Write a new protein. Structure first.
Ligand SMILES: Cc1cc2nc3c(=O)[nH]c(=O)nc-3n(C[C@H](O)[C@H](O)[C@H](O)COP(=O)(O)OP(=O)(O)OC[C@H]3O[C@@H](n4cnc5c(N)ncnc54)[C@H](O)[C@@H]3O)c2cc1C
Ligand SMILES: Cc1cc2nc3c(=O)[nH]c(=O)nc-3n(C[C@H](O)[C@H](O)[C@H](O)COP(=O)(O)OP(=O)(O)OC[C@H]3O[C@@H](n4cnc5c(N)ncnc54)[C@H](O)[C@@H]3O)c2cc1C
Lengths: 692, 691
């Protein structure tokens, strides 16, 4: 059958652009103001618009044909891509450069990192850990401009990743020559996963145990030249190779490295923090402005990346959903668009809410970090209690960072995966991006701190924060709710579940509950004679749960706080609608936490279910506005079913035929392989003669 | 550095010795655990024989597959079909399926490319052809793939799940005794048709049967796509390669359009629906269309989930036994990650789930064979005994659906989790995770979209609830719905290590969800909503019903198969697994059991302590549970997963073999890298202007 809209008849092929226009027609807010909320104002929006257009327009950058590229071409084109991006280094501010590389990561996660290993990790190490004179030297050798020089970052070993303190590569001081000997003692200590090392890097920042006169001073950082710059040949004692095929991100040339008795000058050790004299005396000064703006910054960047990737796929799935019809139960009626189904709304709309929430947690973290850094600077008289609070605010920021990184990276993975399923078998088309994006994304969970290892540390960290509070230490701003003793007795008490203040309190309750009980058990177990370490091991599930509940509560809090703080009036009700869906959905997913603490009873879960259904419908009405608010052009979407105009089948059929021209019906292997098989001769079924 | 048996090992040298240590702890004969997993000694030797015939065959060697581009995968799949074809003359139906599933532990692309002819096309002409039609197509080369290659065109760009809504039309023309097959719009383009782009000469085309302006619904028609001699497209046929997929690139999925294609009437497959030479349409009742194929298919998928899951769980666990990261005692070596309680939690319940998927597969097959016989036996029928066989059947379909959905999603999850359990090394293509996950996941979308199956199931469970309420009979699978005691049952201080108590907890929670959503449905229908609008209003509830019932089914099936088939030497160790599975399952969905009031908050702490305990008991025997799968290094196909445990040495070797390192510079060094590193400086000059 056929659909009639505005006096005209449509078919399965022609209806989609009309359906999606119909959705746009419902939008009650101006989209520009929703885009200002996501990116923190007008100035930021124009900047992002500028950067996005610069990327998309660049001919060498074009991602349109990347799905069909084998690894050798990904490897080659990433270099050409680097040469093009290299034009902006002269011009860009740090903020511009970071944001340009994150925007570009929406569609090319390989090139960004292949540059990134020099641009951030190697340059980060020489700037972060070298003296001014050491930095300036490497820059004169061409390291800032990537001129006859290309760095990489060699920390990970085949045997050690998470436990950096346990690296086995050694750097042995020899006084006679004033040198370090860099040595890989067994093949287990071979450097591993080193981006750029396989084919690109002339130098590395090598992490090795510092050994002077039989004393082990722990892991430090040494510049080791990997290749003769002139010929790209390996320096003496340097072995390295391409690690080969990865799940994803094949454009990056991750290599292994072995060092055998490689001689470097003492001066190649980076010495801002740890210093070694020409006589072999080792010093490690107090160095108070050690403040790891960088550590928080690295995590805030990844929390934002989770946003930047998620918005693409959630946009693809939702636009598809607005036009895709499957099934109906009316004789006279067309099949229902899947967006109209309440189950499908539950699959996608919370994740749309989740993606907005990811950005607010990145923004809230960067802002809390900025006010806390600014607060330290103002207080010269050093009112000590005040400084102590500013320090624990900063400490708890770093700690909260670990959970946010862990969960927003996992969540981004789940969204890519879910959005793919939501588009059915057309999810499995390489051109709709799900496959490649998922494969590329997933490493974010492993590198920059294993997600599970971060969650267990932060879970231990919360128990230590709670126990130190009980002993009279002040709590950092991020875990202040642990001091709130109104939560012991708190219950819903017939309050409104549509009120953000209530839903906030409910996440404070279950976080506090889990952490106080875990801290109590840790105390029973230590008194019982376990060491601190053995007690934390006994409480591995509880530490993980604490990390999880606290992070969830932080996402909820940051969403509401940022709405209250920065949302213009015309968008505010639609954001609260999003926020309530996020928050009530989250409650619904983890109903047990709420039952067990006694905040809700069996009947209140039913009500929560009804509210999630309700906000699903409120969010669904405005869905085109929420998704168009991301401001992604079709180039960033990079999937036919997700294009702005909504002509899902026309573009998809176009994309397939463009990349797969159909004029020849037989495969390249038809004569060689397929034809010989289909036309094979019959078996010889004679049997040998034998008398009798 | 570590000392074992008075000898020195390092990070590189230890791992083979560590894994041998774990084998030393095993308290059962591993061969009996294999017998349990595969239903006894005979099946096991058949499996062994098959696996070895696959491993040996040089054409099928999968060692270099990860590095292979799409063009290679496509060609290679055909060479592999040629080699696998050597077994068609001799295999039984049992051996052929099994050989094909075993093969798909390592090559998800080839079995499907063969499969579309082998299973889908042949299945349609056998299933829906008359004997004469079948024999005709066999005579033209179909059975033997001689001058003939089939595919299955059902899906259209417009329709996947809603098969009844397909738009492609078959119009009968008496004058010429022909159907006209036609694709009315581009939306109706057949899509995802494996074999079509490059391989297939013929398709089983699903189209609406139109006779005299009467639409008789979707039927099946054989349509020649290509001239056999030249492989060129036939008049009115347009097809093309769909191109890059997330996975399974070896399969040549195509799109197809039909433009007034004429086929003889006799090409319509006429076992159930017949059209005469005058346009007389007949559809006799005909025994209900034999859905053992439909159930049979879901059972296969459940097993496939076991067959893949075992591989990745084995790789991850063997890795976990040798990998040391972090230590707490200043003097000692770093702790092997398998000794971390949180690592145990991530993997050993998945290992348990792996076994459980098999049990549910085996259970389903048995129940379905058993019900099928108790239909033949009842040639003479007594009103009550024919009715419950029918109702046990219906409840088998529903149970099949949830099982397929959740076991396939679980297998995806297992793959993903095992990859993260191996850290960075999980992201190497050579350790299998990336490609397996990319290939596997489509199982969640085809053969019934997993979400659509769940929402059907949960509607079905509600309807069975309403049925019983109104005096209708209950299928065995949903019997717990008739249990009076359940409504007020509580833990009441009973042992959580007792399987029976755990069964009751799961029965209570499933029944609780179903009955409650039934009351909601009745109340909403009373309110005046139509049956279908109320289900839609209850969509959360239908899903939740399906998940809960399916989880419960997995639990009971595990215990039931252990009690039915576990010898004494392995029983305690399988109850340990089963218990871990069931208690971990309770911990993961604690809110359900709090909400029905079976458990109190105090009981949730005890479940957590028991998950911790059963993790320890299962950890001790890990080598036994994983070796029992009986996979050789060829099936593992991952360096860190190898039998000997020499994880670093195999891994460094695999990498270097595939990536010879003798040349330091990339193939683009002169063309691309070298001109960038040594590019000339910017021109800083500024145009002259007096002013
Ligand atoms: C594509 C890619 C590129 C990379 N590029 C670089 C690079 O350029 N430079 C570089 O230096 N590194 C690089 N790495 C390495 C990466 O930083 C590490 O892989 C990661 O930080 C740690 O992983 P691992 O392999 O050390 O695993 P491990 O730390 O050994 O952990 C392995 C598994 O064991 C578990 N585990 C570990 N410790 C514990 C514990 N105490 N308790 C419980 N469970 C535990 C973890 O959860 C994990 O699942 C790269 C990795 C990848 C995948
Ligand atoms: C690799 C591959 C190979 C294939 N090979 C073949 C082949 O050889 N032959 C062949 O005939 N077909 C083939 N297919 C097609 C495949 O069977 C379909 O993709 C699948 O069966 C149906 O999904 P769909 O794309 O039609 O999505 P739809 O049915 O539209 O579903 C899309 C999304 O909408 C949601 N949705 C749909 N209906 C509802 C509802 N009522 N309520 C709630 N949510 C709903 C679904 O959950 C799904 O997430 C292949 C597919 C793939 C991926």
């Amino acid at each position: 059958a056929n659909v009639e809209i505005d006096g005209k008849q449509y078919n399965t092929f022609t209806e989609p652009p009309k359906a999606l226009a119909g959705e746009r027609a419902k939008v009650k807010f101006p989209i520009k103001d929703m885009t200002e909320f996501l990116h923190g104002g007008e100035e930021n929006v124009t900047m992002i618009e500028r950067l996005m257009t610069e990327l998309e327009r660049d001919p060498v950058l074009n991602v349109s044909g990347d799905y069909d590229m084998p690894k050798e071409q990904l490897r080659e084109t990433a270099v050409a891509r680097i040469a093009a991006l290299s034009g902006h280094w002269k011009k860009d501010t740090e903020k511009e450069a970071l944001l340009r590389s994150q925007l570009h990561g929406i569609v090319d996660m390989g090139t960004r990192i292949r540059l990134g290993v020099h641009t951030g990790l190697f340059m980060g190490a020489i700037r972060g850990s070298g003296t001014k004179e050491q930095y300036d030297y490497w820059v004169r050798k061409g390291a800032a401009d990537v001129k006859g020089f290309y760095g990489c970052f060699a920390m990970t070993e085949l045997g050690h990743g998470s436990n950096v303190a346990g690296l086995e590569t050694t750097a042995t001081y020899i006084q006679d020559t004033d040198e370090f000997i860099i040595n890989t003692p067994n093949t287990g200590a071979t450097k591993w996963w080193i981006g750029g090392a396989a084919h690109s890097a002339t130098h590395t920042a090598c992490f090795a145990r510092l050994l002077v006169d039989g004393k082990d001073y722990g892991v430090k950082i040494f510049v080791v030249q990997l290749r003769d710059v002139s010929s790209h040949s390996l320096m003496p004692g340097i072995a390295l190779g391409d690690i080969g095929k990865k799940m994803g991100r094949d454009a990056i040339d991750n290599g292994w490295i072995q060092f055998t008795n490689v001689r470097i000058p003492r001066q190649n050790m980076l010495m801002k923090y740890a210093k070694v004299s020409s006589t072999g005396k080792v010093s490690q000064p107090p160095l108070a402005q050690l403040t790891y703006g960088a550590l928080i910054g690295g995590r805030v960047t990844m929390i934002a990346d989770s946003f930047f990737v998620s918005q693409r796929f959630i946009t693809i799935a939702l636009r598809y959903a607005c036009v895709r019809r499957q099934f109906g139960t009316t004789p006279g009626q067309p099949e229902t668009k899947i967006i109209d189904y309440p189950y499908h709304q539950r699959r996608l709309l919370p994740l749309l809410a989740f993606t907005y929430a990811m950005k607010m947690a990145a923004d809230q973290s960067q802002i809390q970090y900025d006010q806390t850094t600014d607060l330290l600077q103002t207080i010269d008289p050093k009112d000590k209690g005040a400084l102590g609070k500013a320090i624990v605010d900063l400490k708890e920021l770093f700690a909260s960072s670990a959970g946010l990184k862990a969960f927003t990276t996992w969540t981004c993975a789940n969204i890519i995966d879910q959005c793919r399923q939501a588009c059915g078998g057309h999810g499995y088309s390489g051109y709709n991006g799900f496959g490649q994006a998922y494969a590329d994304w997933v490493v974010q969970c492993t590198w920059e701190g294993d997600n599970n290892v971060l969650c267990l540390s932060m879970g231990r960290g919360l128990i230590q924060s709670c126990l130190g509070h009980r002993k009279g230490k002040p709590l950092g701003s991020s875990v202040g709710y642990l001091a709130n003793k109104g939560l012991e007795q708190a219950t819903l008490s017939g309050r409104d579940l549509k009120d953000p203040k209530v839903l906030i309190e409910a996440w404070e309750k279950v976080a506090n509950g889990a952490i106080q009980r875990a801290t109590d058990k840790f105390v029973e177990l230590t008194k019982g004679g376990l060491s601190p370490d053995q007690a934390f091991e006994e409480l591995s599930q509880q530490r993980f749960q604490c990390a999880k509940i606290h992070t969830r509560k932080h996402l909820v809090t940051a969403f509401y706080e940022r709405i209250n703080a920065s949302a213009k009036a015309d968008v505010k009700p639609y954001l609260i609608n999003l926020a309530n869906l996020f928050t009530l959905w989250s409650i619904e997913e983890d109903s047990g936490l709420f039952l067990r603490e006694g905040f809700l009873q069996p009947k209140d879960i039913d009500q929560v279910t009804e509210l999630v259904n309700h906000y699903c419908k409120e969010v669904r009405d405005q869905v085109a506005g929420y998704t168009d608010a991301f401001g992604l052009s079709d180039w960033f979407i990079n999937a036919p079913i997700g294009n702005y105009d909504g002509d899902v089948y026309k573009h998809y059929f176009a994309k397939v035929n463009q990349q797969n021209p159909a004029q020849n019906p037989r495969p390249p292997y038809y004569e060689s392989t397929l034809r010989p098989f289909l036309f094979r001769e019959d078996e010889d079924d004679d049997i040998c003669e034998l008398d009798e």
